[PDB]
Protein backbone atom coordinates (compact mmCIF):
# COMPACT_ATOMS: atom_id res chain seq x y z
CA UNK A 1 0.00 0.00 0.00
CA UNK A 2 3.12 2.19 -0.07
CA UNK A 3 4.52 4.06 2.92
CA UNK A 4 2.46 6.52 4.95
CA UNK A 5 3.04 9.45 7.25
CA UNK A 6 1.28 11.69 9.75
CA UNK A 7 2.94 15.04 10.36
CA UNK A 8 2.23 18.34 12.01
CA UNK A 9 3.49 21.73 10.91
CA UNK A 10 3.42 24.34 13.62
CA UNK A 11 4.02 28.07 13.35
CA UNK A 12 4.29 30.52 16.22
CA UNK A 13 4.71 34.15 15.17
CA UNK A 14 5.01 36.94 17.68
CA UNK A 15 3.96 40.51 16.96
CA UNK A 16 4.70 42.71 19.99
CA UNK A 17 2.21 45.46 20.76
CA UNK A 18 -0.05 44.37 17.93
CA UNK A 19 -1.84 41.51 19.66
CA UNK A 20 -1.14 37.96 20.80
CA UNK A 21 1.24 35.69 18.89
CA UNK A 22 -0.46 34.15 15.89
CA UNK A 23 -0.31 30.39 16.35
CA UNK A 24 -1.13 27.67 13.89
CA UNK A 25 -1.03 23.89 13.64
CA UNK A 26 -1.51 21.94 10.45
CA UNK A 27 -1.85 18.19 10.16
CA UNK A 28 -1.03 16.18 7.08
CA UNK A 29 -1.80 12.60 6.26
CA UNK A 30 0.42 11.46 3.41
CA UNK A 31 1.16 15.10 2.68
CA UNK A 32 -2.55 15.89 2.48
CA UNK A 33 -3.57 18.61 4.94
CA UNK A 34 -6.38 16.99 6.92
CA UNK A 35 -6.75 19.19 10.03
CA UNK A 36 -5.79 22.73 11.01
CA UNK A 37 -5.82 25.03 14.01
CA UNK A 38 -5.56 28.81 13.84
CA UNK A 39 -5.34 30.76 17.10
CA UNK A 40 -6.61 33.97 15.53
CA UNK A 41 -10.28 33.85 16.53
CA UNK A 42 -12.62 34.49 19.48
CA UNK A 43 -13.17 30.77 19.91
CA UNK A 44 -10.44 28.91 18.04
CA UNK A 45 -10.97 25.20 17.42
CA UNK A 46 -9.38 22.35 15.50
CA UNK A 47 -11.17 21.79 12.21
CA UNK A 48 -11.33 19.14 9.48
CA UNK A 49 -9.61 20.16 6.25
CA UNK A 50 -10.65 16.94 4.56
CA UNK A 51 -14.35 16.24 4.44
CA UNK A 52 -13.65 12.63 5.45
CA UNK A 53 -12.42 13.82 8.86
CA UNK A 54 -16.01 14.69 9.76
CA UNK A 55 -16.61 11.10 10.93
CA UNK A 56 -14.82 12.11 14.11
CA UNK A 57 -17.27 13.34 16.72
CA UNK A 58 -17.23 16.31 19.09
CA UNK A 59 -15.05 14.55 21.65
CA UNK A 60 -12.26 14.15 19.12
CA UNK A 61 -12.39 17.83 18.26
CA UNK A 62 -12.59 18.97 21.89
CA UNK A 63 -9.52 16.96 22.86
CA UNK A 64 -7.54 18.21 19.84
CA UNK A 65 -8.62 21.81 20.41
CA UNK A 66 -7.59 21.80 24.05
CA UNK A 67 -4.19 20.37 23.17
CA UNK A 68 -3.67 23.02 20.51
CA UNK A 69 -4.64 25.87 22.85
CA UNK A 70 -2.15 24.55 25.41
CA UNK A 71 0.56 24.40 22.80
CA UNK A 72 -0.25 27.94 21.70
CA UNK A 73 0.12 29.40 25.19
CA UNK A 74 3.21 27.29 25.69
CA UNK A 75 4.66 28.58 22.40
CA UNK A 76 3.90 32.13 23.47
CA UNK A 77 6.18 31.27 26.38
CA UNK A 78 8.99 29.83 24.24
CA UNK A 79 9.06 32.96 22.10
CA UNK A 80 9.96 34.96 25.21
CA UNK A 81 12.45 32.31 26.20
CA UNK A 82 14.24 32.68 22.86
CA UNK A 83 14.50 36.45 23.13
CA UNK A 84 16.55 35.78 26.26
CA UNK A 85 18.57 32.90 24.87
CA UNK A 86 19.49 35.18 21.98
CA UNK A 87 19.50 38.43 23.95
CA UNK A 88 17.03 40.18 21.63
CA UNK A 89 14.77 43.22 21.96
CA UNK A 90 11.23 42.62 23.18
CA UNK A 91 10.26 44.72 20.19
CA UNK A 92 10.82 42.55 17.14
CA UNK A 93 8.66 39.98 15.41
CA UNK A 94 9.96 36.39 15.58
CA UNK A 95 9.03 32.94 14.34
CA UNK A 96 9.16 29.38 15.64
CA UNK A 97 8.26 26.49 13.37
CA UNK A 98 8.03 22.80 14.08
CA UNK A 99 7.72 19.73 11.95
CA UNK A 100 7.17 16.44 13.66
CA UNK A 101 5.57 13.24 12.45
CA UNK A 102 5.85 9.53 11.89
CA UNK A 103 6.12 7.52 8.70
CA UNK A 104 5.14 3.89 8.49
CA UNK A 105 5.61 1.14 5.93
CA UNK A 106 2.72 -0.69 4.27
CA UNK A 107 2.84 -3.03 7.25
CA UNK A 108 2.02 -0.30 9.76
CA UNK A 109 5.48 -0.34 11.35
CA UNK A 110 7.36 2.84 12.24
CA UNK A 111 9.77 3.56 9.41
CA UNK A 112 11.06 6.90 10.71
CA UNK A 113 10.09 9.40 13.39
CA UNK A 114 11.22 13.00 13.66
CA UNK A 115 10.90 16.44 15.17
CA UNK A 116 12.80 19.52 13.95
CA UNK A 117 12.44 23.05 15.26
CA UNK A 118 13.39 26.27 13.56
CA UNK A 119 13.86 29.78 14.93
CA UNK A 120 13.43 32.70 12.53
CA UNK A 121 13.61 30.38 9.55
CA UNK A 122 16.83 28.73 10.76
CA UNK A 123 17.41 25.21 12.17
CA UNK A 124 17.32 25.25 15.95
CA UNK A 125 17.12 21.65 17.14
CA UNK A 126 16.07 18.23 15.84
CA UNK A 127 15.56 14.64 17.00
CA UNK A 128 18.07 12.09 15.67
CA UNK A 129 16.83 9.01 13.84
CA UNK A 130 17.45 7.15 17.10
CA UNK A 131 14.54 8.87 18.85
CA UNK A 132 16.74 9.17 21.93
CA UNK A 133 19.18 12.03 21.36
CA UNK A 134 18.90 15.63 20.20
CA UNK A 135 21.02 17.86 17.95
CA UNK A 136 21.36 21.58 18.69
CA UNK A 137 22.18 23.88 15.75
CA UNK A 138 23.63 26.71 17.81
CA UNK A 139 24.73 27.67 21.32
CA UNK A 140 21.22 28.72 22.29
CA UNK A 141 19.78 25.37 21.22
CA UNK A 142 21.99 23.64 23.85
CA UNK A 143 20.28 25.43 26.69
CA UNK A 144 17.14 23.69 25.37
CA UNK A 145 18.97 20.43 24.72
CA UNK A 146 20.54 20.30 28.20
CA UNK A 147 17.08 21.18 29.50
CA UNK A 148 15.24 18.40 27.65
CA UNK A 149 17.97 15.99 28.63
CA UNK A 150 17.34 16.79 32.30
CA UNK A 151 13.57 16.36 32.08
CA UNK A 152 14.07 13.30 29.90
CA UNK A 153 12.00 14.14 26.85
CA UNK A 154 13.55 12.11 24.04
CA UNK A 155 11.64 9.18 25.57
CA UNK A 156 8.31 10.87 26.18
CA UNK A 157 8.45 11.87 22.49
CA UNK A 158 9.54 8.47 21.18
CA UNK A 159 6.52 7.13 23.00
CA UNK A 160 4.22 9.35 20.93
CA UNK A 161 6.10 8.65 17.69
CA UNK A 162 6.10 4.87 18.00
CA UNK A 163 2.80 4.76 19.90
CA UNK A 164 0.10 7.41 19.62
CA UNK A 165 1.28 8.70 16.22
CA UNK A 166 1.31 5.33 14.43
CA UNK A 167 -1.99 4.26 16.00
CA UNK A 168 -3.94 7.32 15.02
CA UNK A 169 -2.25 7.43 11.64
CA UNK A 170 -3.67 3.97 11.03
CA UNK A 171 -7.12 5.15 12.10
CA UNK A 172 -7.03 8.18 9.84
CA UNK A 173 -5.82 5.93 7.03
CA UNK A 174 -8.82 3.62 7.38
CA UNK A 175 -11.15 6.61 6.99
CA UNK A 176 -9.71 8.70 4.14
CA UNK A 177 -8.07 5.84 2.24
CA UNK A 178 -10.47 6.07 -0.69
CA UNK A 179 -9.80 9.75 -1.19
CA UNK A 180 -6.08 9.53 -0.41
CA UNK A 181 -5.23 7.15 -3.26
CA UNK A 182 -6.77 9.75 -5.58
CA UNK A 183 -5.05 10.25 -8.87
CA UNK A 184 -5.66 12.77 -11.63
CA UNK A 185 -4.00 12.33 -15.01
CA UNK A 186 -2.36 15.34 -16.66
CA UNK A 187 -3.96 16.57 -19.89
CA UNK A 188 -1.17 17.65 -22.23
CA UNK A 189 -0.89 19.98 -25.20
CA UNK A 190 1.91 21.78 -26.99
CA UNK A 191 1.90 25.45 -27.86
CA UNK A 192 4.04 27.24 -30.44
CA UNK A 193 5.55 30.68 -29.91
CA UNK A 194 7.72 33.05 -31.91
CA UNK A 195 11.36 33.88 -31.26
CA UNK A 196 13.65 36.28 -33.07
CA UNK A 197 15.21 35.09 -36.32
CA UNK A 198 14.61 31.49 -37.38
CA UNK A 199 13.89 29.94 -33.98
CA UNK A 200 10.61 29.04 -32.31
CA UNK A 201 9.62 27.88 -28.85
CA UNK A 202 7.63 24.76 -28.22
CA UNK A 203 5.88 24.55 -24.88
CA UNK A 204 4.58 21.31 -23.45
CA UNK A 205 1.75 21.82 -21.02
CA UNK A 206 0.46 19.47 -18.35
CA UNK A 207 -2.76 20.49 -16.64
CA UNK A 208 -5.21 19.21 -14.01
CA UNK A 209 -2.99 16.48 -12.57
CA UNK A 210 -2.72 15.25 -8.98
CA UNK A 211 -0.61 14.61 -7.03
CA UNK A 212 1.89 17.34 -7.85
CA UNK A 213 4.79 15.02 -8.71
CA UNK A 214 5.36 14.93 -12.47
CA UNK A 215 8.09 14.82 -15.09
CA UNK A 216 8.06 16.37 -18.55
CA UNK A 217 10.82 15.86 -21.15
CA UNK A 218 11.64 16.99 -24.64
CA UNK A 219 13.31 14.61 -27.06
CA UNK A 220 15.03 15.37 -30.33
CA UNK A 221 14.31 12.10 -32.16
CA UNK A 222 14.27 10.27 -28.83
CA UNK A 223 17.28 11.59 -26.93
CA UNK A 224 16.31 13.92 -24.07
CA UNK A 225 17.19 17.60 -24.31
CA UNK A 226 18.55 17.89 -20.77
CA UNK A 227 20.40 21.04 -21.77
CA UNK A 228 18.76 24.49 -21.66
CA UNK A 229 15.24 23.11 -21.53
CA UNK A 230 13.14 25.62 -19.62
CA UNK A 231 10.48 24.77 -17.03
CA UNK A 232 8.30 26.40 -14.37
CA UNK A 233 8.00 25.05 -10.86
CA UNK A 234 4.88 22.89 -10.45
CA UNK A 235 1.99 25.14 -9.36
CA UNK A 236 -1.52 24.72 -7.93
CA UNK A 237 -4.34 25.32 -10.37
CA UNK A 238 -6.42 26.28 -7.34
CA UNK A 239 -9.01 23.50 -7.66
CA UNK A 240 -6.94 20.74 -6.07
CA UNK A 241 -4.86 19.88 -9.15
CA UNK A 242 -1.55 21.14 -10.57
CA UNK A 243 0.12 22.54 -13.70
CA UNK A 244 3.59 22.44 -15.18
CA UNK A 245 5.32 23.22 -18.45
CA UNK A 246 8.59 22.58 -20.22
CA UNK A 247 9.79 24.34 -23.33
CA UNK A 248 12.68 24.31 -25.75
CA UNK A 249 13.85 26.54 -28.56
CA UNK A 250 13.97 24.70 -31.88
CA UNK A 251 14.66 25.75 -35.49
CA UNK A 252 11.74 27.12 -37.53
CA UNK A 253 10.30 24.35 -39.70
CA UNK A 254 11.94 21.62 -37.58
CA UNK A 255 9.10 21.37 -35.05
CA UNK A 256 8.02 17.89 -36.11
CA UNK A 257 11.42 16.53 -35.05
CA UNK A 258 10.62 17.01 -31.38
CA UNK A 259 8.52 14.95 -29.02
CA UNK A 260 7.26 15.90 -25.61
CA UNK A 261 7.05 13.29 -22.85
CA UNK A 262 4.81 13.36 -19.82
CA UNK A 263 5.27 10.97 -16.85
CA UNK A 264 2.70 10.95 -14.03
CA UNK A 265 1.55 8.19 -11.69
CA UNK A 266 -2.01 8.61 -12.94
CA UNK A 267 -1.15 7.55 -16.46
CA UNK A 268 -1.69 3.98 -17.63
CA UNK A 269 1.40 4.99 -19.63
CA UNK A 270 3.41 8.20 -20.23
CA UNK A 271 2.12 10.67 -22.78
CA UNK A 272 3.93 11.38 -26.00
CA UNK A 273 2.85 14.41 -27.98
CA UNK A 274 4.02 16.92 -30.55
CA UNK A 275 3.33 20.40 -31.85
CA UNK A 276 0.25 19.98 -34.06
CA UNK A 277 -0.12 22.73 -36.65
CA UNK A 278 -3.70 23.26 -37.90
Amino acid sequence: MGPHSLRYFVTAVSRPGLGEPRYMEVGYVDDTEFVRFDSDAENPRYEPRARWMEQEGPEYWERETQKAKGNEQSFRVDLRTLLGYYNQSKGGSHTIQVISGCEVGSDGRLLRGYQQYAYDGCDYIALNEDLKTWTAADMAALITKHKWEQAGEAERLRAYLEGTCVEWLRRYLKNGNATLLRTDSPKAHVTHHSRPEDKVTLRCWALGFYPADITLTWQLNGEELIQDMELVETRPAGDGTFQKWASVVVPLGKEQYYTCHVYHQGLPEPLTLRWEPP
Partner: peptide
Protein backbone atom coordinates in the same frame (compact mmCIF):
# COMPACT_ATOMS: atom_id res chain seq x y z
CA UNK B 1 -3.62 13.15 16.84
CA UNK B 2 -1.60 16.22 17.83
CA UNK B 3 1.26 16.10 20.33
CA UNK B 4 1.91 18.19 23.43
CA UNK B 5 5.01 20.30 22.95
CA UNK B 6 7.78 20.73 25.54
CA UNK B 7 8.74 24.25 26.59
CA UNK B 8 11.91 25.55 24.98
Amino acid sequence: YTAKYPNL
